């Protein structure tokens, strides 16, 4: 056979970096029921930021290694962040079940990317007791994957309506979650950053830090 | 690297009313809590007040219950304190600290500090 | 109601040594203690946030530590500014954001 003695890559002309920082240095997260989305294009985006933090615990990612992030290349990266319990985190997997990911935030069976999860006491906790935070209780059956519910409408489930008035035998279907400092780390608010990787063929747009070099022909 | 100004400091007889004033420019103001803190002229720090991101949630310093209003304005990026009902004892240095969360009272402390303005209650 | 109370009021060292300041609390506050750095010359700022996390950009020689009842800040350099006096913090309990008693630290 015949071995090759030369070596190139080529990767797009962009270098501007783009904000990994405000995803997660942002003071406060929304609620995960109605959870906020970010879309990320048209950058190199570094990975080493996020690696090298003791806090961010949590870091365990589906279909991709995690130390490969910094050579890959996607079309495009989507970031959703919310506040749930300590136990709840868990429940942020593909394919199992779940409260939140029955009506809340479910992702879906052929999911691709990584979930960030890290202690949030020093924000989110409140001695009075903290109720920015909702979640989503009662819904007719599972949402589907990467779906927001903001619906506010009054729960009946049985087999006489109130007709959408919280009288007899009809609930408010948001429930505050009650975050106090002096609760134990089962439920102990945690924030949560899911990345989303749609790997294709398509011209992408965001890639790892990389040097491209001279395009050897033959 | 912020500026944290303070002004409206002096010195007042007992039972009268003054004001301050802290204009907050080197972050974004309309996310952050903030507090006013008192440095006794002998003694260490005291907590005074707080205002949370939002005029939300309120909480006092045990102290000064029923005698001190804290105000904030987002549209101008500063926050007011009006002093009333004044005695003899609240002569120190009061601080115009800010906190890290948005909430008032959580485990996140005060994280940017500003000059302090002098305050007298005599005759 | 919690209590705080430091063991040393005066300390002395030189400029090459290294000294240590505890702070401890009448009831567990589960490590949620914060050390503020006050210079008498300007304002106070914070090094220590947390039980042993160090805020970005204040040198790296001061270090918290200690976790529950008991905290300790630690200083290895002593470069020739350190001269001020430090408080401790907690913001755990009910009575909000009290304060423990200054810790005059002096160069001999």
């Known amino acids: 056979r015949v071995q090759p003695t030369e070596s190139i890559v080529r990767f797009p002309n962009i270098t501007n970096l783009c904000p990994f920082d405000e995803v997660f240095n942002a003071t406060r997260f929304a609620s995960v029921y109605a959870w906020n989305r970010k879309r990320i294009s048209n950058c190199v985006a570094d990975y080493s930021v996020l690696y090298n933090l003791a806090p961010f615990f949590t870091f365990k990612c589906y279909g991709v290694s995690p130390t490969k992030l910094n050579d890959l290349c996607f079309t495009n990266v989507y970031a959703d962040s919310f506040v749930i319990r300590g136990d709840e985190v868990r429940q942020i997997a593909p394919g199992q079940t779940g409260n939140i990911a029955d009506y809340n935030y479910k992702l879906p069976d052929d999911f691709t990317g990584c979930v960030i999860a890290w202690n949030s006491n020093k924000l989110d906790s409140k001695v009075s007791g903290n109720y920015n935070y909702l979640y989503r209780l009662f819904r007719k059956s599972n949402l589907k994957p990467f779906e927001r519910d903001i619906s506010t409408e009054i729960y009946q489930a049985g087999n006489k309506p109130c007709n959408g008035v919280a009288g007899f035998n009809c609930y408010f279907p948001l429930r505050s979650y009650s975050f106090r400092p002096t609760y134990g780390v089962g439920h102990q608010p945690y924030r949560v950053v899911v990345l989303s990787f749609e790997l294709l063929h398509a011209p992408a747009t965001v890639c790892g830090p990389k040097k491209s070099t001279n395009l050897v022909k033959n | 690297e912020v500026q944290l100004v303070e002004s409206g400091g002096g010195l007042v007889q007992p039972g009268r009313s003054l004001r301050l004033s802290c204009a907050a420019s080197?972050?974004?103001?309309?996310?952050?809590?903030m507090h006013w803190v008192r440095q006794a002229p002998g003694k260490g720090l005291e907590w005074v007040s707080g205002?949370?991101?939002?005029?939300?949630?309120?909480d006092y310093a045990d102290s000064v219950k029923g005698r001190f209003t804290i105000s904030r304005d987002n549209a101008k990026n500063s926050l007011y304190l009006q002093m009333n009902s004044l005695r003899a004892e609240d002569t120190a240095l009061y601080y115009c600290?800010?906190?890290?969360?948005?909430?008032?009272?959580?485990?996140?402390?005060?994280?940017?500090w500003g000059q302090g303005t002098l305050v007298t209650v005599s005759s | 109601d919690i209590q705080m109370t430091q063991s040393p009021s005066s300390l002395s060292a030189s400029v090459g040594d290294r000294v240590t300041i505890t702070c401890r609390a009448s009831?567990?506050?589960?490590?949620?203690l914060n050390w503020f750095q006050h210079k008498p010359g300007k304002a106070p700022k914070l090094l220590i946030y947390?039980?042993?996390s160090l805020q970005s950009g204040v040198p790296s020689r001061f270090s918290g530590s200690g976790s529950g009842t008991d905290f300790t800040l630690t200083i290895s350099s002593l470069q020739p500014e350190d001269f001020a006096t430090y408080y401790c913090?907690?913001?755990?309990?009910?009575?909000?954001?009290?304060f423990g008693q200054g810790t005059k630290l002096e160069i001999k």
């Open positions: 080197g972050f974004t103001f309309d996310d952050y809590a």
């Open positions: 947390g039980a042993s």
């Open positions: 913090q907690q913001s755990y309990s009910t009575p909000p954001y009290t």
């Open positions: 205002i949370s991101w939002n005029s939300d949630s309120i």
């Open positions: 009831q567990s506050i589960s490590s949620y």
């Open positions: 600290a800010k906190d890290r969360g948005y909430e008032i009272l959580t485990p996140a402390s005060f994280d940017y």
